[PDB]
Design a protein around this ligand. Structure first.
Ligand SMILES: NC(=O)c1ccc[n+]([C@@H]2O[C@H](COP(=O)([O-])OP(=O)(O)OC[C@H]3O[C@@H](n4cnc5c(N)ncnc54)[C@H](OP(=O)(O)O)[C@@H]3O)[C@@H](O)[C@H]2O)c1
Ligand SMILES: CC[C@@H](C(=O)O)c1ccc(-c2cc(Cl)cc(Cl)c2)c(C(F)(F)F)c1
Length: 315
């Protein structure tokens, strides 16, 4: 139930999203990560931005101390936040994540976003008028510092997130490139299937990783409340009736059958265990076709602040 990356390492096909808005107490992240591991999740997706590596790190070590799982069985993912894009800031930001998560290494270390921000300890650098402050960093130099982390054995694999094709090509055509990004974690779901980008990554042996596969958490901070609810789609519901499954299981299985590693966030014990039921059933060739036809080029995250960034991936 794993896929081989272009560096030889293997990543579980289903991953547990660990982001919850800050209004949720951080103790929940420690509990649901235990429930997710008990339910079958081995791939755990986190980030320095999420502010939960302390809790997710303890939940991993707890379930290891239980004997329920071993560290090698767990595929931990972290992300380098935008404020730490400069080369001298990459390795310090990774070992800080390692120190907080109580880990000697991360399985996967990502560039969280190509939209560089002003360097500093603050994650949302704001100016006097409410503007988020942008920065100008050559991401090829950022990637070089990621390569030094993989050679230092602090990240078994390295990759990117929220990169478009041309932003990927910039890395792929970098003189002196030592490692290729094993993955590119982007927003992907039946409404935003990213089919064109998916064929590009497959032709370079880059694993597409779908976040907001269940249509996101719909935070009013970033999501228009008038956008359609993904899991209330008539086609996904009608397929949920046909396979006696849930609309969510249809959305996750769709990504698995098309070669996309899927993430699934949930802070409810019953919906955590229900998500691993994605391995019990299968969709026909027709049903995969029906889901492909729901595409509407709709990304649920939309903000005017980032849309003026020169590295804003969408257009
Ligand atoms: N690289 C990036 O830039 C990036 C961006 C966004 C997200 N991510 C990662 O991807 C993960 C998932 O993305 P997301 O935050 O948008 O959440 P999501 O996977 O799209 O899920 C959306 C909502 O669906 C609910 N849910 C879970 N299982 C369900 C089920 N069987 N049936 C019905 N509803 C279910 C969950 O609510 P409940 O919690 O109440 O169960 C969840 O809030 C995140 O946690 C994060 O790790 C990465
Ligand atoms: C809050 C959750 C967080 C996570 O990583 O889970 C997250 C969600 C969405 C985005 C995002 C938003 C836009 Cl509008 C465009 C794009 Cl490309 C990406 C970002 C990012 F990358 F901006 F930081 C981060």
């Amino acid at each position: 139930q794993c896929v081989k990356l272009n560096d030889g390492h293997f990543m579980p096909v289903l991953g547990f999203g660990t982001y919850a808005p800050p209004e949720v107490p951080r103790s929940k992240a420690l509990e649901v990560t235990k429930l997710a591991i008990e339910a079958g999740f081995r791939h755990i997706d986190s980030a320095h931005l999420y502010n939960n590596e302390e809790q997710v790190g303890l939940a991993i070590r707890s379930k290891i101390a239980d004997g329920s799982v071993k560290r090698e069985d767990i595929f931990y993912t972290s992300k380098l936040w935008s404020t730490f894009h400069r080369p001298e800031l990459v390795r310090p930001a990774l070992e800080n994540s390692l120190k907080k998560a109580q880990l000697d290494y991360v399985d996967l270390y990502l560039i969280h976003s190509p939209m560089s921000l002003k360097p500093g300890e603050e994650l949302s650098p704001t100016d006097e008028n409410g503007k988020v402050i942008f920065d100008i960093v050559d991401l090829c130099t950022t990637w070089e510092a990621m390569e030094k982390c993989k050679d230092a054995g602090l990240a078994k694999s390295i990759g990117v997130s929220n990169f478009n094709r041309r932003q990927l090509e910039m890395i792929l055509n970098k003189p002196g490139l030592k490692y290729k990004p094993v993955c590119n974690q982007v927003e992907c779901h039946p409404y935003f299937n990213r089919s064109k980008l998916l064929d590009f990554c497959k032709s370079k042996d880059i694993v597409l990783v779908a976040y907001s596969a269940l249509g996101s958490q719909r935070d009013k901070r970033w999501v228009d409340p008038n956008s359609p609810v993904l899991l209330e789609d008539p086609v996904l519901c009608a397929l949920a009736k046909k396979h006696k499954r849930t609309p969510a299981l249809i959305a996750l299985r769709y990504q698995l059958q098309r070669g996309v590693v899927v993430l699934a966030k949930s802070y409810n014990e019953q919906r955590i265990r229900q998500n691993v039921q994605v391995f019990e059933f299968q969709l026909t060739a027709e049903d995969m076709k029906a889901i492909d036809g729901l595409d509407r080029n709709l990304h649920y995250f939309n903000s005017d602040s980032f849309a003026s960034h020169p590295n804003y991936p969408y257009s």
